[PDB]
Amino acid sequence: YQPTPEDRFTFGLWTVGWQGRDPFGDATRRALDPVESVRRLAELGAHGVTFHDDDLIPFGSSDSEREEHVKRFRQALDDTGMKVPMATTNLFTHPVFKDGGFTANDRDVRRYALRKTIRNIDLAVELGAETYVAWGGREGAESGGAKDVRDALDRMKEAFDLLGEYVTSQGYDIRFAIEPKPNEPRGDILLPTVGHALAFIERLERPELYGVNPEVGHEQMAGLNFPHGIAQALWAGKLFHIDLNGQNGIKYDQDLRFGAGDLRAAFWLVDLLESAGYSGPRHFDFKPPRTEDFDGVWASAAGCMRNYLILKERAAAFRADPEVQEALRASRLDELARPTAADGLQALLDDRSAFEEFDVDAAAARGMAFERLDQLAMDHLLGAR
Amino acid sequence: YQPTPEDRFTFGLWTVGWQGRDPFGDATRRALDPVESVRRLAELGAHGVTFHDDDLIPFGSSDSEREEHVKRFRQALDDTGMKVPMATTNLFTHPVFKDGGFTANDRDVRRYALRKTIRNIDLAVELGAETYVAWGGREGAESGGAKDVRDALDRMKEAFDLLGEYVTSQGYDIRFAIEPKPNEPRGDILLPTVGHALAFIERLERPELYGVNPEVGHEQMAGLNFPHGIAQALWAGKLFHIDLNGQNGIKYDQDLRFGAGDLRAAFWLVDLLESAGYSGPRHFDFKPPRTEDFDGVWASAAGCMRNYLILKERAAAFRADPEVQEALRASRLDELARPTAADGLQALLDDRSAFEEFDVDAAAARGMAFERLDQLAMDHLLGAR
Amino acid sequence: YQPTPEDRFTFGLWTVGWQGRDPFGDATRRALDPVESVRRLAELGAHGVTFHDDDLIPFGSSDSEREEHVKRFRQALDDTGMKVPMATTNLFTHPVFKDGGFTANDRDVRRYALRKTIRNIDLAVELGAETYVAWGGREGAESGGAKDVRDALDRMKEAFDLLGEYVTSQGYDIRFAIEPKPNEPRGDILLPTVGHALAFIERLERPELYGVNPEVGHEQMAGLNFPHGIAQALWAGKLFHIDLNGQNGIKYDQDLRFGAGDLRAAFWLVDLLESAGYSGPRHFDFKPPRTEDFDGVWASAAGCMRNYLILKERAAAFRADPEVQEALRASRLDELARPTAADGLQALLDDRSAFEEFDVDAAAARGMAFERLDQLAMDHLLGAR
Amino acid sequence: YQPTPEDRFTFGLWTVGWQGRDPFGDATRRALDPVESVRRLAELGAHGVTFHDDDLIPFGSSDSEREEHVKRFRQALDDTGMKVPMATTNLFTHPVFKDGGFTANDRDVRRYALRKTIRNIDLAVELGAETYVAWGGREGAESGGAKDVRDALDRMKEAFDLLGEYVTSQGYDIRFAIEPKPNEPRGDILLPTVGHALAFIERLERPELYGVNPEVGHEQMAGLNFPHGIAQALWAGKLFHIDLNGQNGIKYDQDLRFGAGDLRAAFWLVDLLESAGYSGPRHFDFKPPRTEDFDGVWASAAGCMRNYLILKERAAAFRADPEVQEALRASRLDELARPTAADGLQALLDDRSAFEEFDVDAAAARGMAFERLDQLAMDHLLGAR
């Protein structure tokens, strides 16, 4: 289960670089130089890194400081062969964004958020990114009167439409990926799930430029089934990027390493990504727990990739097992994939087998055989066949 | 706070008619004749009722039995002046639907579910319904291998497209409203939230024929903000119907009377419906607790309407209060409603006030004044001004 | 991973006998004769069964009917070698218990609940049960005024004290195990967690007669860590029985087969039970999904036991691995098990190494090495070492 | 609804002093001098303040710095008439406590945590505190192997027993209050609920010295009913202190002002505290949202007290209303408060009215009338009678 760059594993600078500050806690680790993170991730077999603007260039940097930060980062990428497939904007840390970036009540803040984003889109393209993520973590409210959501969605659409006009104006090939989250740091965040983000994208002027960046733990913060949401995003043609981590159900955003949290959901996720032929980065947005020193940071990052590769092997073995293939037919997964009425509406209306002569009791008596199928899946996951 | 039919309050037959069977419990009330429910609801000031096919006509009825059930119901509606604005299909109780109706793995069950629906669309139109709800409560899974969600969504789209072809073929004006729910009775249900349903509708052949029927408690079963989801549905033009009830957060579907559960969410919901000018039925999908006798059933139904009317008065008083109007300006709700960049992309890029000369610290220091605004809202809700 | 009776696996009659009725659904399976369940469970390698009074003898049975039901059951136990280690009372299905059994507001119902329990304690002892479970699933409320919880706890203590007086009066060796659950079917249930039940037991007249019967899914319905709660029950000496199943987080009570739901929690549970030398029944309180026919019922029951045995092997291998033993020392699990201050309070107060000369920064810099330890645990669970 | 010091409202220095740092965000407010907080809270009508050691004296202060911080604070208390009824230790912010204080795996950290606590107990007594709170926010784990919970509970008991020996040795009257929380900042926290803490206290050497400090939002983070948990703590005689705030269900710890979050739960809480004659501080452990400037901080603090006083008036009016008193009798709340079997076990066994001649159907048919009672409660809360 040794990863290599060909596995397309990527990490945010802010993941392994997390210093361990939490609601209640000061830093437990010193800051990491992005150059060191690139070198250490490459040695573990990562393919690339990703960044927020303010992870790569300290907020408030001069043009000479900005050029030197980017030069040193480019040298680390060149020294390692690491790529930068995705970048994003920090529209959440600075107190100016306390009520939002693109949906701040203050119009001057909304305009600044757009200019900050556009500046970093240019840098992302220079570093070779194909995807630009937007996580509107400050978009939302703690109280009902504070935010008129229809007005906020109008502002959010304006912002994304302006960004689409910008990349079209520059001839850039980059596409956007909107990252849902239901809550935290706002009491409720706008576009709280994959579904809400998919729905929103359909109302943008150029919907083809936008997809989703779903994160395992975010959908699980609403108690939702992450593989099901990924399936809907794939069905819509909108899975442009993905964030992999672990979460234990409905609680604060834990950002555990991938494979931790809901292990069986991780198995079904990998099964789906691999079955569907998802071709994008396998990006980890996780935080090594603050209990860890730097050795533990690199162990946690290595574990992300290891767990993906174990689950990939087990899912592939499940799907290739003739006994599983027989169980899938016994459970009518083949019939689920066949059109209900390719004969057409009139033929269905005229088919007595579909109503007048349908033996509902005989159909009801047919077991689905799902428990045997699921225990084959469990046996494959655990290596107990 | 006395309701009259002009308030457009509606109830499902299955609400006040719930006999009190639960996971763990036998019935605590005798069955109600739909005629008696129509009479009792009319006396409380309801505007109308709604039905599943199998609430009005027992499953398996002969044509003569069906005609007599409908005749008696029509007489009760005529005697009271009650309307039938919405109807729906039961695709969940009979064991044949144990793996779904429109997304059952068994193709013969999917065809039967469509024929059962189409038969009841014809009856709904005869009784004057404008909306046909679909709650796919059996669509989903308890295990990962049992249901390929992309295939299931293909089947769900086929089904809704065939229903749209049917009502277009008959020249009916009825529209569809898809009701999301995240789980229960399936471990995970497909289209689990308002957002997922809105997203799905955009991929139907005739999206204009379909909207959502969100239910208070269903979105709250995922920990989501129900008023925010309603705002997104209104923003999309898709709030075709609504189900009102109460829920205490993330747990089984409680179906408490409206106003119970999350009271402040109920206040902000009513504020939004009324502000937006929502014109559809205020439908209650609730269950009088099984602790209650029939007197308690009618008290619980009356309480649904009373609570709506109290909250309507308090929300209107909040929005009309000059002190609240001043607080809304202090919190920049006026500025949230103004375009970010009607001057256009190039003007924004050339505006030094938006980046080079934006004083981020001065903007960050400006408080939002949201707590004062929210305490005015609390004082209005409680009648403590 | 083949179970035998020596593994002490037990099942409730109501588990494999569940006919599949849910909030929203009619039965999908015919009723099972308890004799057939005993025979089929024995063939799978179960050690025994458990029962509610009303699972073994239909409610309202005559004395001659009761004797014949018990005779046939005793013959099945004799034919198979199956045991009956635990029994319980149904104080939840009949509508008389709609507001509770022992804490019903109606005093005549509370007295009846006690007489119903006492009658079944006598039968449990005749069939050889060592444990008598009490799940107060109707004890609680949907509204705040309905139930004064201090008064209800006074009634609950009276009831348990009377039951303790009864078994002491008869010279029975049976002990009680209180089963917590946070909600469902009541909006909130009294004694909602392991902790609340443990706390309550300490206020009973004869606390030694009472322990807990925790259920995996019940603690997970409150988002709690089931292994941690089991550890507290073991620390208190009160783990008298356990109910094993699966649950996906905070939602309705799913009662999935054991190993389903939170797989890693199942691993840590088995690790703890086995490490601690828990000697009681490994009882499954689960429901084969209603999608299944009888073949699927027996497959789901077999899977409960298989999954326990797989996890037992992997947990034992984890704890016996020298590399894990080294990682445990690196993470200071040895030091967690050593007294903080066996030198005594005065010695601690006089120890400059504990305050004046404690190098907080050196201590803070020491990583815990928990991620490496947890990835060893993951590798052992998955058979990926 | 104007508070005065006679209402016993208290606030932590860290509440109104919260600078607004969150997972994802830098400070939005400057630090407050404790002297200014004491003055501003007094002007709002607060009775007193509370502190962690490190809120009053910066961590690492010299003895001369410590004396000056305490002198200035004492002068502010003297200038205002404010009291200090409770104090606590910060065993969570400094990185040394990353794996716990009293249950850290490192024994030297456990000894330091005890010395840090003991030093602040002495200061708390000097400032007149009656209660010493312990919130073990770092006690717990993110992974299963990291923490053996039985060993951790042994360490936690040693720590609390040593603290009890210390205050007994000094002749102090102060008592301890253990504050449960289910998670955050640890993935799971030990003693996660009121029940678990109550259970633990019964195993301490001197249980009379220890009670609970429950917090509204903490129990609601597990989806539990906070008034029910308070009722159990009152039933046990262990409600030594309480933390009041608001929370929207199962998510990160929001610390909203009291009355926000679950409004009806706030009503039933106040009803219970007032009915029971709870005599301790009404302490607010809340965070003014980071959206707010200092004017908003003081508005949010004022709102805490206002909301308590509104709910106190409405709860008192509910209980005093003759129509409510009649509804309570109709719902048999009087009968809930009467012993089940003061006639004794033998009399119950010999009472045919309790079994052989109990008419279960007549009892089952009697409605509980809980919905009418709850709508009277709603009408009282909303001022809609």
Ligand SMILES: OC[C@@H](O)[C@H](O)[C@@H](O)CO
């Ligand atoms: O909850 C935090 C989010 O996951 C971010 O890390 C985004 O992925 C990018 O800003």
Ligand SMILES: OC[C@@H](O)[C@H](O)[C@@H](O)CO
């Ligand atoms: O959870 C149950 C659903 O709310 C239904 O009552 C639908 O509204 C219509 O089938």
Ligand SMILES: OC[C@@H](O)[C@H](O)[C@@H](O)CO
């Ligand atoms: O939630 C249901 C409970 O688990 C019961 O099955 C008990 O174990 C015994 O009545």
Ligand SMILES: OC[C@@H](O)[C@H](O)[C@@H](O)CO
């Ligand atoms: O979740 C944080 C806790 O509520 C603390 O504020 C305690 O009350 C005292 O340390």
Ligand SMILES: [Mg+2]
């Ligand atoms: Mg997970």
Ligand SMILES: [Mg+2]
């Ligand atoms: Mg996250």
Ligand SMILES: [Mg+2]
């Ligand atoms: Mg992310």
Ligand SMILES: [Mg+2]
């Ligand atoms: Mg609600």
Ligand SMILES: [Mg+2]
């Ligand atoms: Mg519902």
Ligand SMILES: [Mg+2]
């Ligand atoms: Mg509904």
Ligand SMILES: [Mg+2]
């Ligand atoms: Mg589980």
Ligand SMILES: [Mg+2]
């Ligand atoms: Mg259960």
Ligand SMILES: [Mg+2]
């Ligand atoms: Mg159980």
Ligand SMILES: [Mg+2]
């Ligand atoms: Mg609250």
Ligand SMILES: [Mg+2]
């Ligand atoms: Mg808190």
Ligand SMILES: [Mg+2]
């Ligand atoms: Mg607190």
